[PDB]
Write a protein that binds this ligand. Sequence first.
Ligand code: AKG
Ligand code: TDR
Ligand code: NI
Length: 335
Amino acid sequence: GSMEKAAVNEDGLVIPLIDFSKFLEGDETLKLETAKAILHGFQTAGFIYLKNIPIQPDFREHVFNTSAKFFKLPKEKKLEVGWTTPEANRGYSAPGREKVTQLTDPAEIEKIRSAAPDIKESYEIGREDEPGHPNPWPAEQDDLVGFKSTMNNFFDQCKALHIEVMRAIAVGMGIDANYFDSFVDVGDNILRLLHYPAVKSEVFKINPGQVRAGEHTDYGSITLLFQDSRGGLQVKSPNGQFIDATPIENTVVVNAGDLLARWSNDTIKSTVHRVVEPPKQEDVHPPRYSIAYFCNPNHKSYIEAIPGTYAAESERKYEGINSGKYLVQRLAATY
Ligand SMILES: O=C(O)CCC(=O)C(=O)O
Ligand SMILES: Cc1c[nH]c(=O)[nH]c1=O
Ligand code: NI
């Protein structure tokens, strides 16, 4: 059974490239081989690349064009649909500079003045019918006619891919193929549209420590990351070095989040990643677009060690937790 050349292979970090159609359409042997490859990727790197996913490239291109049209809106129109609370986790955001005030501790004043916020903006969409948390959609005029219908369609197709990736994980683990279905079928996911504005490379010298997206781990089960061809995404290697996650045409980068790491009793890795300058020399870095679809267990789900991820009970590292509660704690922490 032919395995593809790794998407990334540097400094001990090996991120496999996997043809997802072989899990969905292959005979039983090929299906299992592919599922095991997916699982092995999550167990080692915490990251995989998938090609030939059910989401069509022309639709993805349209979704990116539609996203670009949103971010071209004037600042006042974007702020009108602003991110409000961590428990909603929906709407427009752009990181601002912290201000010095009467209340600030003088030890922190030097840091605040020299701090460089991430050069990015985002717009987050949740499932439409979540009680108490409506999506703040912008008005549908001119270029934004079709915005909602496009993004809701994309949301549901990514929701479907989440279910299938978890099925691959289950098949790879040798547990019931549909084990995760009842934990993920609600689609309590977040569609994060990202725009990193064009920026002069000198900005990164004027502001040392400046990045496009600060280093972090994702919170949920998995993240489906669709990136354009600009580059800048980096994944931390097992030797502690950030390695370039090179863009590959018509792939989706998939990584496990902290909840899946915990759920798997740390058999699956949630790996630190960031976005920095693209690895090419140029005076001006053009705009970068990406879409992060954060997949989560159902907010009602109780998360405890998956069967087959431990032998003796003493090997369980974590107490059970409610999924929804965990996420809001992560979202609310910074504020
Ligand atoms: O833009 C990217 O490629 C990464 C975005 C990301 O890691 C995130 O939004 O959590
Ligand atoms: C990084 C991150 C931000 N917002 C979310 O909802 N989930 C995540 O994993
Ligand atoms: Ni991330």
